[PDB]
Each structure stands twice: as structure tokens, then as C-alpha cells.
Design an enzyme around this catalytic site. Structure first.
Site, PDB file in Angstrom:
ATOM      1  CG  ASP B  13     -21.623 -62.522  20.253  1.00 17.26           C
ATOM      2  OD1 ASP B  13     -21.698 -63.764  20.840  1.00 17.26           O
ATOM      3  OD2 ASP B  13     -21.635 -61.642  20.708  1.00 17.26           O
ATOM      4  CG  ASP B  63     -23.772 -64.110  27.326  1.00 16.50           C
ATOM      5  OD1 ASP B  63     -24.716 -64.408  28.089  1.00 16.50           O
ATOM      6  OD2 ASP B  63     -23.746 -62.897  26.645  1.00 16.50           O
ATOM      7  CE  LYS B  65     -27.701 -62.119  27.384  1.00 15.91           C
ATOM      8  NZ  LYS B  65     -26.392 -62.288  26.954  1.00 15.91           N
ATOM      9  CB  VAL B  66     -28.741 -70.673  32.366  1.00 14.52           C
ATOM     10  CG1 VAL B  66     -29.538 -71.643  32.697  1.00 14.52           C
ATOM     11  CG2 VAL B  66     -27.480 -70.867  31.704  1.00 14.52           C
ATOM     12  CG  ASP B 181     -17.783 -43.332  27.150  1.00 13.11           C
ATOM     13  OD1 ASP B 181     -17.222 -43.036  25.934  1.00 13.11           O
ATOM     14  OD2 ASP B 181     -17.130 -43.283  28.059  1.00 13.11           O
TER      15      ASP B 181
HETATM   16  O1  LIG Z   1     -27.726 -57.265  28.561  1.00 13.67           O
HETATM   17  C1  LIG Z   1     -26.958 -57.677  27.765  1.00 13.67           C
HETATM   18  C2  LIG Z   1     -26.387 -58.991  28.074  1.00 13.67           C
HETATM   19  N1  LIG Z   1     -25.811 -59.466  27.139  1.00 13.67           N
HETATM   20  N2  LIG Z   1     -25.457 -59.072  25.903  1.00 13.67           N
HETATM   21  C3  LIG Z   1     -24.306 -59.616  25.123  1.00 13.67           C
HETATM   22  O2  LIG Z   1     -23.178 -58.950  25.235  1.00 13.67           O
HETATM   23  C4  LIG Z   1     -22.657 -58.770  23.727  1.00 13.67           C
HETATM   24  C5  LIG Z   1     -22.757 -57.430  23.297  1.00 13.67           C
HETATM   25  O3  LIG Z   1     -22.016 -57.456  22.057  1.00 13.67           O
HETATM   26  P1  LIG Z   1     -21.693 -55.935  21.245  1.00 13.67           P
HETATM   27  O4  LIG Z   1     -20.598 -55.242  21.870  1.00 13.67           O
HETATM   28  O5  LIG Z   1     -21.601 -56.364  19.724  1.00 13.67           O
HETATM   29  O6  LIG Z   1     -22.918 -55.388  21.355  1.00 13.67           O
HETATM   30  C6  LIG Z   1     -23.289 -59.709  23.111  1.00 13.67           C
HETATM   31  O7  LIG Z   1     -23.061 -61.221  22.876  1.00 13.67           O
HETATM   32  C7  LIG Z   1     -24.912 -59.807  23.543  1.00 13.67           C
HETATM   33  O8  LIG Z   1     -25.487 -60.916  23.467  1.00 13.67           O
HETATM   34  C8  LIG Z   1     -25.646 -57.795  25.660  1.00 13.67           C
HETATM   35  O9  LIG Z   1     -25.420 -57.082  24.673  1.00 13.67           O
HETATM   36  N3  LIG Z   1     -26.574 -57.177  26.430  1.00 13.67           N
END
Ligand SMILES: O=c1cnn([C@@H]2O[C@H](COP(=O)(O)O)[C@@H](O)[C@H]2O)c(=O)[nH]1
Ligand SMILES: O=c1cnn([C@@H]2O[C@H](COP(=O)(O)O)[C@@H](O)[C@H]2O)c(=O)[nH]1
EC number: 4.1.1.23
Lengths: 218, 218
Positions: B13, B63, B65-66, B181
Site C-alpha cells: 500500500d 484488493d 473491495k468491490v 498476531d
Molecule cells: O478487513 C480488512 C480487509 N482488508 N484490509 C486491508 O489489508 C491491508 C492491511 O495492511 P496493514 O498490515 O498495513 O494493516 C490493507 O491493505 C487494508 O486495506 C484490512 O486491513 N482489513
């Protein structure tokens, strides 16, 4: 927000040439264009600046933002950097995710539109039962712009009741999905129209026709 | 099911192409599966998927999230698979028709849908959580084989695993930065998604290695 003819073009064509041509064909009737992922993922985010250059129209980015707060913030920042005036955000993922969008919009001088109930049949499964509460959440958060379903005028009316007459409400599902332009404008400030215009044999005539049908509503 | 190296999926990201490419390259020996979302795509274009394929031997999960109506969902999926994504993440809360639209395109185009059930952030408790078991059961009924659930709520992740069965493929986000974790999460998930814990580290390769060392017995 002052939307010419209370009509927002949903430009979901996925080819730059067609998208620009059709938008040009109806430009005399609109000054507000909703751009979504079909066009953006096919042609790039630079298409937003190109619309502003050619038409001077305002741009609502219909990105259905629906991630965690941290990612929502990044999405909003990228979108406003590309020149969008506003962004549509889902309320279902909760208040923190909406606030993340509100923060960026404030920072960059833009607007968040909160989507509360969607227009398609599947909206009945989960979204509809949460919709009033999502709208009250918008009110609590200071949201001033909302999106609701043309396909269910009774639900659109309830949404208007919740947010009040001061809030700005736009509505999708007009035409192709079955909603009626004039009935929808009983409750919404503006109607979103895609396929009824952009798939028409003559898009300008289609737009003209819709406007004629609501002429007494402005 | 897709064979995810080290049960570890990088959430890339970062929004800068140079940084995203650098960090991904640095952890390439540990990870053969990369999740690319809208922060990067809206910043650098859908061609970033092509670039990652060319530069790294990694599968790509988009990802996105459609979360639109079926007609728009179909277009989003087509554009995403056309660009070279192996799979796409789709919201279940907009209902079954919206999910089905994505499944149909994925079937036609030879790719995969991951259904997001419950999200990992606090706001998920407001509306998503109460719908999540039903969304999961809906996924099972629709023939969905791949799912996403929350690392931050082991009890909910366990229940999602039960609903979808041992044969389904489950990945989980919220590991590290959001509090999940790695080891506990892998009691139920096939693979963990990790973003900031890796990509914001002074040494992302060391960060990934450390995570992997902590789960080596799994
Ligand atoms: O329920 C969800 C679904 N998708 N993401 C996505 O997973 C990644 C989590 O990244 P992180 O390890 O930096 O928190 C990010 O791209 C976020 O948009 C979540 O965090 N939680
Ligand atoms: O509840 C909603 C929210 N958004 N849209 C969006 O509004 C446009 C409707 O276009 P149409 O007139 O061709 O149906 C499309 O871009 C669609 O993604 C809906 O249709 N319904």
C-alpha cells in the site's frame, strides 16, 4: 452544490474516446459528471483532469470507498490529487472509516457523499436494514451529502426525512434500473443517470428527453 | 488452492512507484503473493500490476473491495482481470447479486474471487460484524472458495473458518499494525496479509524474515 438541470451523468463507458465523445454530446445539458472505476481502471486517473480540461465540469468520484480508515485516507488523497471534487463513500464499514474520508476532504477542500442504501435488488439483504442507522451516523458525523436509491422512492423519502432538507441528496438507479426521474426528484436534489443516456442511440436526445420530462422541476 | 509461499501475503500500500517496487523486490525471496490495492493503483495506474508481474515472480490479488451494483461490479472485475490480476477481493454486504456478478466474470475469465466477510477495523463492529456469518454462509451457497476475515478478532475468524469449511481458502488481514498476531491467526487462516509491519520497517526483508521465523513450525 449546484447541479445543472438536476442531472448528473454517470460516465461508465470504458473507452476514453467514447467517454469523451458522449460526454461532449451532452455537455450543454450537464455540468456535473460522476466518474467511477469502470472508466478509471480502464483509462487511468488522468481522465479526471482531461474531463475538467474539456468540459470544466465538476467530478464526483464514485469509488464506493469501503476499506479500513488508514486505507480510506490514502484512497481519498489519491482521488482528490487527481482533481475529483467529491467522493462517494460506503457507510456500512462504520464511522471510523467514514471519518477518515471526511478528514481528507476537509484538508483538500472537497466533499464526501455518504452512500446509505443502494439501488439494486441485493441491497435488500444487508444494506437496507442498516440504512436508516447509517444515515443517522452521517448526521452525527456532520455529513452533508448523501446518496440513496431511485428504485425505492419510499426509502429515498425516509432518507430525506432523516438527513433533513438542508443536506444534499443524489440518487442512482434512474432509467435502466427502473427509477423514474420526476418521482426521484420529489426527494433527491439531483438524479444520476448512466445507461439511459450513454447507451442511447442518440445520447443528447436522451438527455434532452429526460430534462423535458422534469422541466417543471427545473 | 493457490500456493502462498511462507503463508505470507504482502499488502503493498505504498503510493510511490519507486518505493513500492523497492520494498517488494527486497522481500521477494520470502513472498510470492502480493496484494495490490487502490492506494497504489489510483496513484500509479493499473499498469502497476503488469510491472509487478514483469519484475517479480508474484501472483497478484487486487484488493478492490468491490462494492457496487452487479452491472458495475462486472465491469470492475473485467478491467481488473484484463490488467493481469489473478484474483479480486469483493465485499459481501451489497448482497448476493453483486457477488454473483463478480463470480460470473471470474469464471468466464479464468480467475478467482475472494469474498470479504468481516473486516478487521473497529468500525466493522457497527454493521459488518452482525451480518458476517450470513455473508459467509451466502458465500458458501454461491460456491465461493476464497475468503477474507479479521486477524484482530480470533473468535470471529474461527467461526468464519467453521462456516466455510476446511476446504475453503482463507486469508486474513489486520496482522501486526492493527494488532493481530501471525501465529494465532494461522490457526484458522491459510495465509496472513501483512502491510505496514513490513513496508514501513527500516529493513522490510528483516521484518518479513522475523515474521516467518515466528511461525516456522506452521
Ligand atoms: O478487513 C480488512 C480487509 N482488508 N484490509 C486491508 O489489508 C491491508 C492491511 O495492511 P496493514 O498490515 O498495513 O494493516 C490493507 O491493505 C487494508 O486495506 C484490512 O486491513 N482489513
Ligand atoms: O446504489 C447505487 C449506487 N451507485 N450506483 C452507480 O450509479 C450509476 C447508475 O448508472 P445507470 O443509470 O447506468 O444504472 C452506476 O455508475 C452505478 O455504479 C448505482 O447504480 N446504485
Amino acid at each position: 452544490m449546484d447541479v445543472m438541470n438536476r442531472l448528473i451523468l454517470a460516465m461508465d463507458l470504458m473507452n476514453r474516446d467514447d467517454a469523451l465523445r458522449v460526454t461532449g454530446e451532452v455537455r450543454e445539458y450537464i455540468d456535473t459528471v460522476k466518474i467511477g472505476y469502470p472508466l478509471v481502471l480502464s483509462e487511468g486517473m488522468d481522465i479526471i483532469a482531461e474531463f475538467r480540461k474539456r468540459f470544466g465540469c465538476r467530478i464526483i468520484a464514485d469509488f464506493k470507498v469501503a476499506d479500513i480508515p488508514e486505507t480510506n485516507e490514502k484512497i481519498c488523497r489519491a482521488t482528490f490529487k487527481a482533481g475529483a471534487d467529491a467522493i462517494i463513500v460506503h457507510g456500512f464499514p462504520g464511522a471510523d472509516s467514514v471519518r477518515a474520508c471526511l478528514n481528507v476532504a476537509e484538508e483538500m477542500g472537497r466533499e464526501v457523499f455518504l452512500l446509505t442504501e443502494m439501488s439494486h435488488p441485493g441491497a435488500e439483504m444487508f444494506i437496507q436494514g442498516a440504512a436508516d442507522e447509517i444515515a443517522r451516523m452521517g448526521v452525527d458525523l456532520g455529513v452533508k451529502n448523501y446518496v440513496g436509491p431511485s428504485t425505492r422512492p419510499e426509502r429515498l423519502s425516509r432518507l430525506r426525512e432523516i438527513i433533513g432538507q438542508d443536506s444534499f441528496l443524489i440518487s442512482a438507479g434512474v432509467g435502466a434500473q427502473g427509477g423514474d426521474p420526476g418521482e426521484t426528484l420529489r426527494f433527491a436534489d439531483a438524479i444520476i443517470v448512466g445507461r439511459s443516456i450513454y447507451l442511447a442511440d442518440n445520447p443528447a436526445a436522451a438527455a434532452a428527453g429526460i430534462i423535458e420530462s422534469i422541466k417543471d422541476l427545473l
